Symmetry: C4
């Protein structure tokens, strides 16, 4: 633990990014309509405050060296978009790269940090995603990468405007070590894709290679989670490990895969950023994004990422030869404990654990191991497929259905003991007893344990 | 994507180099005769414009510190060779090393970049191959290697002469990351040899070791292709991965090995540089170099290297214990798709793929997966062994037989739909159907798919 | 061998640290009571001189930039604690980090080395544990880490006060190479835990990965010993490999595990620092800490760490799939030899060795291989469970029971031949004969061999 | 190839070092007696010119900062020893470390390069072995190690005295790349030991790990040879890979192991430095050192290290689980070829090769593959055990028995075709025929092939 370097990111950020679906194809209308839609679906009031505009937004640089927004896509300027967003209680996020160009080939900020930082402040920006493309060889050791990213960190501070600073260097040069003191969140891997396990030649580093020299992209959900496992210890209040935007609602993942993906991202205190097209979001995906129970885990005050307790490879492998089972446990602020039984195998299986395994750093005969604990299924009481369809199809309102965090912070709700945030009690676990369930293929059992 | 740093290399370079056969043994006559021969065989007009003179060309340095060409080998100077080449519509390329000496022990350019750059400009040079021998410990991190190669990059720019800058550092210190902003192409491995699979003690890094600390040489064709697989994502217009000169016509590769080698080099957008002795070139090798269909893939406008979709090891291993099968797919500018089924096994085998595998980043129900595609064998209509022999034996002319890119750029030919550039339609692939062929040992099936 | 850079640490340091049990929860009273208790139990006079106060002791920094001790925990200041300790013949140790903050988030010493060094001298400090948290990207190569730690090394020297300088960078950037010239001891791994073999996701580097890029913590006893194995050759008089505080009396290790852990730590010349709560220490653990025989090995004059002679994996694996057997041998100053037969297997087993294996660098027919050697069980004559309980329960005094090193240095005792420091002779080993024993699961046979 | 940076080391150096047997225990008498003995046994006139004094020779530094020789060991100074050596036609070599201290703890030369260099010149030194102990963190990248060793390289040059500069950094930071331009030879691994295959915990890097981060020591003969295999390509006239002093006559290697060890060291163009006590040298070891045939390979003009053609692991493993077979081939200056069939297996076995395998870089139908070659056993006509005993026991003189290179350089002898230097013709190898022999366990078949 250390204080937030800039007072922001006391919990992981939440919001939305246009990349995963719209890529370069962007506009003022797309952004604002989507913003409205996110607000209308009640996701904004769940915490999804950040509207993040990605790459391909500028047209070039003007006479003063300052950045110029592509007026075809943005005919009123950027600050105009910020204002619309602020008026609807959103926060506004923009994109750049710590290099000559951005990953799509547009002007980059390397050596031009102050001008660009000021441009973002001038256009009333709250959040900067800062990439790693075309960095002119300014990487390869922790020090050199640290200074390149400190440049913009300092540049933003100089503008006097509070800006949530999001590093996007894919974990290059061991970012988990040096991120906290200059940033609020750092990407720790190459880009995620809508694949749960699939290895990819574009993502050469496997799950064990947290110190990757070619981060790449099209990395699977399990590849990134596996890379993040040891990094939890270097995350905390004010500085988080970023496992990339959520793929829930994107591509062709199963409901089980989407739950597992969303739960784990929340349990390791990763930024929860919607990658889906909210105007073309399916019901099952929508109810996953809106699971207040799980969001509460991610938004835990004085957040601590969960720890992977064990991992075994299984003979039940998928079409890609992948198959492993995992257990994760983690402390919660109010004395509770998160537990995940993760079945990455190709077949439905029984999974089990004990109190000894759950409270991994507790000695024999200690309170936690000698007490009885109530088990809450965090996935219970999820918005059903019919209700979600109705809300998405504008027939119903989200009001009264989805938990409102604007009305009542997650911390408050936990203090008040909202069944809304704790899921449903399905039983209890006692010393010398075993917790057992059936966990679907590529699925999860996700519990919150409370003392009896 | 980013713009070409110097406006050159909008497609991968094509041409010829004396090293693979003649090594140090060089002369004005060898160069000029070969140039004429390349022109006469019609290869020049296919795109093979660059005549690259390699090592062992200088005799020392003169009183002014400037380089001096070995007058026994070059009695008229270098600019005299340039002129002959320009007159015959060739472009002229020379060699140096970012070190104290060249790999053969001749004067090197380290710390003497401006003088040497100017010398090349003064002798009207269009292309520089810039090696990595005797670099005085100026390597080991990306930064230090970047600055060493930037030195000459800057030095060439200062001369005001357009020069195609070809890096030859064998991928040391992760060149794929930093090459684009200062160069047009970069060697990404140690030297190739006329072996398809053979591991070599002089090339200690295997196919998976793209981050190699001892690049070495005598690396097999499959060793280099395997190293290049993840690097595709860091190549594009103006900056290419260089998998070293072609070994087609050199050594004792089979026809199938030569086709596979040539196709893959083209599909990953590698420089296509003839390493063969064109005055002693055999028929089968000649027809491979002259396959307009395959060159069109390499010379695709807005070029994107193909992606390796899958790779499996097989029990059919050769004399060296090597045996793997690969599938590669890649987007083409006009909406087409390149597909390669690569049999690196020791035995002829059936190979298969689907549309789902071919369009690897396409969601279910999307156009590409729901449409029907016509399959074109890119190796059809190749110059036969009799015709090629006749052309090489001067009995026939290449004119009217080989596609003339000078007369009609590859892009135009693709727009005009020249059967010359598309191969022969052998069928079509529909959703839920499987594409199946028989692929020879160490051979390839190489397709272009067009929408129906 | 090289002289001690500062004249201290001629043998490995011994003492106690509050972290392993009390963590942040500390006070003047806790420290002083514990000090008294350590003295009363006779451990002080065995060599456990250093009372090391860990993290969470400061409240902030004062107006002059100097450090300020948290007056709630320390209402008389630090020098007041030093004095009480000096008066009772203890030495006083404090904590800081070569970073912006300490690992618990309190003021760190990076860039503020002189002020902080002076503060420690002013408060009459004898020992500094200097951590690696929040180091602002000042790591990644040996050189950069070396200078960061040299900064404080120099800063302490400037104060003119003798200070035992203990590095705590977890072996990052190959500390064993550069530690000796600027420090007395260096942590060579991430934090130990009360687990003998258990792999942990928070400690990603296994036993073979001595060059670890994410040191982590919760590393098992065998994980750290395995990492230390090759490092012996870079330790000696004045500069030692530090395998972290002893876990004897902490958590739930078996008696056999505690003996193995304690013996090995001693045999490799690691600092012997009590991590146990001495006010809640159990009998068996107490008798282990008080084994004069084993301490004599650690405190050997002109100390040389032992060498691991062999290591095999066995099918007798524990609940964590871990199971290996090891033999270690090491020269002693008086011509004797330490031998350890280490059974990390899950089952009791016979273990054997010869003189050829014991004297691993001795040629055939040399004196050591041709002589006969007496075998001394170093674990014989250990304080029994009844006597220790009595001493801990204040019924008996340690005086007359525990060896007094203050009264008679270990070297003297070895010269005088105290059966107290040599254990019990259990037999002899002759050329061509085999030394065989039964070694318990997770246990050790620990011998001193003397010439007949 | 590149010229020798200083004109020395046109062939690998030959001589003797006191370390392998006498370690720190040294004197003027030991050195001079040994020198006389080496001369009397006729080894000096075989090329063993360099008498290298190792560590533990100085007593401290004098008032001027200059080095002071330990007058108990050297009561006449060092130049006095040089003179005795020059008078007997020897060359004199001394030791230092690019660090604060030497490996035994005596004054080191880091930051004091000029004074020390001048001290060596003043005492008429011809050769410097320059170690890597206590280097104050000045390693970790190629550049930093390069400059540290360039310091002394420059310092020696400044003295104007020709000095053979021998690097001893154990291959740290890829020395094979940067050694040539500043040195004559570089250690490429940790210290050798009298073990043929034995893995050792003090030498953690295996045979494949040429890029070692903890070089260590007590590395086996096969461990070092395996590390050196890829490095041949970076050695040549003026700059050689050093595989450490010869262990022939030291410890308890078999005659077959000693032959294999000596042959391979010669074939890869390593320095041939006697590590044995020449006053206690056994017959079989003596005849190995004196095999003119094999020395001629090492001392080949325009020397090129041999290439390992293939390597397979065998089921015939020794007590340490080690067992591999190797074939090495290499070009010789006069057009001949060295061939080694190396049996690292535990059992005697038949080994075979063809001309295609021997001439690994020759195409089918080329002269070398189509010609017939005469096979010469390089180990034939070796001094027998009786004659060697007599010479060592002073009964006979070496004169007329051992080849005299002082009288006739190896190059001359090869030109004159001395059966003395070629071994005995045992047959011939023709195209499509197989060369087969029986090779002993841990033994070698070592051939020179000549065209018929
Ligand atoms: O472009 C915005 C992108 O930046 C970050 O990217 C990492 C990724 O960038 C490139 O990927 C893409 C494919 O999505 O490839 C082309 C450029 O050739 C671009 O259209 C696009 O960015 C590189 O090709 C990859 O090497 C690199 O891994 C960021 O992580 C993304 O979220 C996104 O914001
Ligand atoms: O010399 C021209 C050569 O430079 C580059 O070199 C890498 C390669 O150089 C040396 O190998 C040599 C140089 O003459 O190449 C032949 C092999 O056919 C050998 O006779 C000789 O050793 C170094 O010795 C090697 O370590 C190194 O791998 C460039 O990459 C080549 O394309 C070529 O232009
Ligand atoms: O001492 C001369 C030695 O220097 C080089 O060795 C590296 C090696 O040195 C140390 O080994 C020895 C044992 O031989 O250990 C003691 C004290 O530690 C010394 O007397 C002696 O040098 C280190 O312990 C090792 O870690 C280190 O690797 C050189 O390589 C040798 O050839 C020789 O010249
Ligand atoms: O706080 C003093 C501590 O510093 C060293 O620890 C390394 C260890 O620090 C961090 O862990 C901490 C502190 O131990 O433990 C909890 C749980 O994470 C946090 O409050 C705090 O950050 C890092 O998280 C770990 O990655 C790192 O390994 C030292 O080694 C200890 O002996 C102790 O003095
Ligand atoms: C994944 O593939 C499924 C087929 O199993 C397909 O249904 C999804 O595409 C969506 O189909 C919907 C038809 O009910 C359509 O209304 C929706 O717009 C479409 N989504 C997109 C992005 O084209 C596929 N899912 C996704 C997210 O692509
Ligand atoms: C290795 O062990 C052999 C027995 O296998 C032994 O003979 C060697 O010792 C040497 O023996 C010589 C007579 O054969 C004797 O003259 C010599 O003094 C002796 N060397 C030493 C150091 O004692 C052993 N060889 C070595 C080199 O130690
Ligand atoms: C600027 O930096 C200081 C810390 O030096 C911090 O307290 C402050 O909040 C930062 N301000 C902004 C606007 O980022
Ligand atoms: C003393 O107690 C320990 C338990 O901590 C036990 O394991 C050990 O065997 C006892 N000692 C003896 C000699 O039995
Ligand atoms: C010479 O003696 C050695 C003993 O070490 C033995 O290996 C070898 O076989 C002997 N030579 C002959 C020719 O018998």
């Amino acid at each position: 633990v250390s204080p937030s370097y800039n007072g922001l990111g006391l919990t992981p950020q939440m919001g939305w990014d246009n990349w995963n679906t719209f890529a370069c194809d962007v506009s003022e209308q797309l952004l604002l309509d989507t913003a409205d839609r996110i607000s209308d679906l009640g996701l904004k009031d769940m915490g999804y405050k950040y509207i993040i505009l990605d790459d391909c937004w500028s047209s070039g640089r003007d006479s003063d060296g300052f950045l110029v927004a592509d007026e075809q896509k943005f005919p009123n300027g950027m600050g105009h978009v910020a204002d619309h967003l602020h008026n609807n209680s959103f926060l506004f996020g923009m994109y750049s790269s710590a290099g000559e160009y951005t990953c799509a080939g547009y002007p980059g900020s390397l050596g031009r940090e102050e001008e660009d930082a000021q441009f973002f402040a001038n256009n009333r920006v709250d959040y900067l995603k800062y990439a790693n493309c075309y960095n002119k060889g300014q990487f390869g050791t922790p020090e050199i990468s640290y200074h390149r990213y400190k440049a913009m960190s300092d540049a933003l501070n100089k503008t006097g405007r509070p800006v949530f600073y999001s590093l996007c260097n894919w974990g290059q040069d061991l970012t988990f070590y040096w991120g906290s003191g200059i940033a609020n969140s750092w990407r720790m891997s190459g880009d995620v894709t809508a694949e749960f396990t699939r290895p990819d030649s574009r993502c050469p580093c496997d799950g064990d290679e947290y110190d990757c020299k070619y981060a790449g992209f099209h990395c699977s959900i399990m590849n990134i989670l596996n890379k993040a496992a040891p990094m939890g210890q270097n995350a905390g209040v004010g500085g988080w490990n970023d496992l990339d935007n959520l793929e829930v609602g994107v591509g062709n993942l199963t409901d089980d895969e989407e739950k597992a993906h969303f739960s784990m991202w929340a349990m390791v205190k990763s930024p929860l950023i919607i990658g889906a097209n909210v105007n073309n979001l399916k019901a099952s995906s929508y109810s996953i994004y809106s699971q207040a129970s799980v969001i509460a885990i991610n938004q835990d005050s004085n957040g601590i990422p969960a720890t992977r307790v064990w991992r075994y490879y299984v003979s039940d492998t998928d079409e890609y030869g992948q198959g492993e089972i995992q257990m994760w446990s983690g402390p919660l602020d109010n004395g509770d404990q998160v537990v995940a039984l993760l079945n990455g195998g190709s077949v439905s299986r029984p999974m089990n654990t004990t109190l000894e395994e759950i409270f991994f750093d507790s000695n024999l005969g200690s309170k936690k191991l000698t007490s009885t604990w109530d088990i809450y299924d965090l996935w219970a009481n999820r918005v059903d497929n019919s209700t979600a369809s109705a809300i998405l199809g504008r027939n119903k309102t989200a009001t009264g259905i989805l938990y409102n965090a604007t009305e009542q912070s997650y911390k408050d709700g936990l203090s008040k003991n909202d069944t809304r945030l704790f899921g449903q009690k399905i039983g209890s676990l006692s010393p010398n007893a075993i917790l057992n369930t059936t966990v679907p293929a590529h699925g999860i059992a996700f519990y919150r344990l409370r003392p009896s």
